[PDB]
Design an enzyme around this catalytic site. Structure first.
Site, PDB file in Angstrom:
ATOM      1  CG  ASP A 115      54.866  35.972  29.598  1.00  0.00           C
ATOM      2  OD1 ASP A 115      54.478  34.868  30.031  1.00  0.00           O
ATOM      3  OD2 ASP A 115      55.899  36.527  30.021  1.00  0.00           O
ATOM      4  NE  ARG A 135      56.104  33.412  33.535  1.00  0.00           N
ATOM      5  CZ  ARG A 135      56.156  34.728  33.730  1.00  0.00           C
ATOM      6  NH1 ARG A 135      56.098  35.560  32.691  1.00  0.00           N
ATOM      7  NH2 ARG A 135      56.357  35.208  34.956  1.00  0.00           N
ATOM      8  NE  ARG A 154      52.062  31.962  38.960  1.00  0.00           N
ATOM      9  CZ  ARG A 154      53.306  32.098  38.512  1.00  0.00           C
ATOM     10  NH1 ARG A 154      53.518  32.715  37.351  1.00  0.00           N
ATOM     11  NH2 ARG A 154      54.319  31.578  39.207  1.00  0.00           N
ATOM     12  CE  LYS A 159      52.456  34.536  42.911  1.00  0.00           C
ATOM     13  NZ  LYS A 159      53.542  33.539  42.721  1.00  0.00           N
TER      14      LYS A 159
END
Length: 359
Positions: free
Chosen positions: A154, A176, A236, A239
């Site tokens: 991430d 991600r 997202r 999100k």
């Protein structure tokens, strides 16, 4: 040289490393040392710090739940994910760099700023955790973190922190999430003028659109999103859920093939002055609460809590977005509310000021 401007919104007041004498790292070892230091630091990135193979490579067995086509990205079987989420997905061999899996630990009172269009970290992201607070990350780029692998890393991780201001940061080609907000309280956070580049060679939707954009899953979060450029994503974006109060103002959502917002229970969103251009679906899931300023007259209700009227959003070749829950607006009383401009200036302003190098 130092931090330019000041945080607007919930994180108003951040000082980072303050006026500590600037340090200039020459190696990745120095950078890591300064970020996890005990002293208030003002770290200036004058070049790209590549971490890609600094921690080797791992070979293992993952799964492909989104197709076996080369345009699709696969998942590293982390925490038995494949088994209890995609028990039907074909197993596939995965080979990724270890550096990306976990980000550089950032401690309290830090100011990480890049110089011009030179400051950048490649192959490893940042991780503001363990109660770290009063941090400023400005004008840097965090890219190339195991693009083909979900769970491969991430970009920006905030998990248990407070007073974090991320400004003029550009994120691209991440396996991600570009931004993941805790699970623990992240409290006051201000994401401003950031450029989220969703253009990738591998995507969960197999079309070059990044699905894992922004994930606000904090336990008690107050997030301000202003002047951000969310581009080329498929989901997202963002999100929102858990216990997050999101003030989404003057952002430019452009070229989103899929959906933008995903509001779950515990997610409260005030979307004003944003511009949605070529966003197929602006709102996918809606289980929380949101006020999108349906009209100018409706914007007048903000007056009591925000101290001013809310501004409407603009829509161009995009799906609709109209919700009017006002019950949560009281939560803005006694907080630092970012000002809002009209949506008519947003598109032009964002593409010219969002991201690294545009500082």
């Amino acid at each position: 040289v130092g931090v330019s401007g000041s945080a607007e919104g919930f994180a108003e007041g951040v000082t980072g490393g303050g006026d500590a004498t600037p340090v200039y790292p020459d190696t990745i070892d120095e950078l890591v040392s300064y970020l996890g230091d005990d002293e208030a630091r003002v770290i200036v990135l004058t070049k790209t710090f590549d971490f890609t193979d600094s921690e080797g490579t791992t070979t293992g067995t993952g799964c492909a739940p989104w197709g076996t086509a080369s345009a699709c990205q696969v998942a590293i079987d982390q925490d038995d994910w494949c088994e209890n989420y995609e028990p039907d997905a074909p197993s596939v061999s995965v080979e990724y760099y270890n550096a990306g899996v976990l980000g550089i630990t950032v401690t309290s009172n830090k100011s990480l700023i890049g110089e011009g269009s030179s400051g950048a970290i490649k192959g490893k992201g940042l991780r503001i955790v363990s109660g770290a607070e009063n941090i400023i990350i400005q004008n840097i780029a965090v890219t190339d973190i195991n693009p083909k692998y979900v769970w491969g890393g991430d970009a920006i991780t905030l998990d248990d922190c407070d007073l974090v201001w991320i400004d003029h940061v550009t994120t691209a080609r991440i396996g991600r999430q570009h931004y993941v907000l805790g699970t623990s309280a992240d409290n006051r956070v201000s994401l401003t003028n950031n450029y989220i580049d969703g253009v990738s060679d591998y995507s969960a939707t197999c079309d070059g659109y990044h699905y894992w954009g922004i994930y606000l899953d904090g336990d008690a979060d107050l997030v301000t999103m202003k002047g951000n450029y969310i581009y080329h994503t498929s989901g997202r974006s963002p999100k929102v859920q858990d216990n997050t109060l999101l003030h989404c103002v003057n952002n430019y959502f452009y070229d989103i093939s899929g959906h933008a917002f995903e509001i779950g229970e515990g997610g409260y969103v005030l979307a004003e002055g944003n511009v949605f251009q070529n966003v197929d679906t602006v709102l996918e899931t809606y289980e929380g609460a949101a006020f999108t300023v349906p009209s100018t007259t409706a914007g007048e209700v903000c007056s009591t809590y925000l101290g001013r009227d809310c501004v409407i959003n603009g829509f161009g070749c995009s799906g609709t977005f109209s919700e009017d829950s006002t019950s949560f607006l009281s939560d803005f009383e006694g907080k630092n509310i970012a000002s809002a401009s009209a949506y008519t200036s947003v598109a032009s302003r964002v593409v010219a000021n969002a991201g690294q190098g545009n500082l």
